[PDB]
């Protein structure tokens, strides 16, 4: 985006929960443009999370997404030769895409055979503070506060 601000895409509210964060998470599950398959994954994964746990899958989905949001991260910036890992805050929009992408990526690193099993189990572990996605988040905030010595290169 050199000219404009590159406005954000406004996604369709969910057919089931009427929530836009659901659809956005469904889209990250989708591959090769099979949105019908990707929805049946997520919704069948909502049956799993709501049976094995007596709670509402909507609230666990959000509570999981929240625990994976990183408050800071590191970027590179060319300064006097070789560049540096520079810690800086994360836009509230970027906390969206990162937490969602991480959850889907983590769940597919999982042992479980079927897809919806892995989604539900990940969401549950993530909402409890463990699981693969929260590791990528706790490891990123570790990059910052380690390179905290370059907080003057904010940019």
């Amino acid at each position: 985006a050199r000219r404009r601000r590159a406005e954000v895409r406004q996604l369709q509210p969910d057919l089931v929960y009427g929530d836009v964060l659901v659809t956005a998470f469904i889209n990250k599950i989708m591959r090769d443009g099979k949105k019908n398959l990707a929805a049946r994954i997520f919704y069948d994964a909502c049956k799993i999370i709501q049976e094995k746990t007596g709670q509402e899958p909507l609230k666990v989905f959000k509570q999981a997404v929240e625990n994976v949001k990183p408050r800071m991260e590191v970027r590179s910036r060319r300064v006097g030769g070789a560049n540096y890992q520079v810690p800086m805050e994360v836009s509230p929009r970027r906390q969206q895409s990162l937490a969602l992408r991480w959850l889907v990526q983590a769940a597919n690193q999982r042992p479980e055979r079927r897809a919806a099993v892995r989604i539900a189990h990940e969401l549950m572990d993530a909402a409890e503070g463990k699981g693969g996605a929260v590791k990528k988040k706790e490891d990123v905030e570790r990059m910052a506060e380690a390179n905290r010595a370059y907080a003057h290169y904010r940019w």
Binding site: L15, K35, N36, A39, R40, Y43
Partner: protein
């Protein structure tokens, strides 16, 4: 007695004949859910009725031909919204913020010579 709108989306048409009744919907001589239902997005086509709470008022007999089934669902959505305004023109002010009466002008972009599929450029090496 009866109200109608055309509706169109991405090379697909669905004639929507709205008739006051129990609330059962027929599509191509089949149940609404014998045609769809294996398709999650199907219930979107009936969102015009839910916006005005017209679920239990009307039956619907629909003829859909052309395109694939997902565009057929959007074409129904429009035909349902179009007939819905011909019934009561006061339903424009309610249906319009949601944009159900807007046609979706997005169609498959034409393939172009020298590319692979109309935007995707053949990959090169330079060495």
């Amino acid at each position: 007695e009866q109200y109608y709108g055309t509706g169109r989306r991405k090379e697909a048409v669905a004639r929507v004949f709205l008739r006051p009744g129990n609330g059962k919907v027929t599509v191509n001589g089949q149940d609404f859910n014998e045609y769809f239902q294996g398709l999650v997005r199907a219930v979107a086509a009936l969102e015009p009725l839910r916006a005005v709470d017209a679920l239990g008022h009307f039956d619907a007999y629909i003829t859909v031909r052309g395109g694939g089934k997902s565009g057929q669902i959007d074409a129904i959505k429009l035909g349902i919204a179009r007939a819905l305004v011909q019934y009561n023109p006061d339903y424009r002010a309610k249906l319009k913020p949601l944009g159900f009466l807007t046609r979706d002008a997005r169609v498959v972009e034409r393939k172009k010579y020298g590319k692979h599929k109309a935007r995707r450029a053949p990959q090169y090496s330079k060495r």
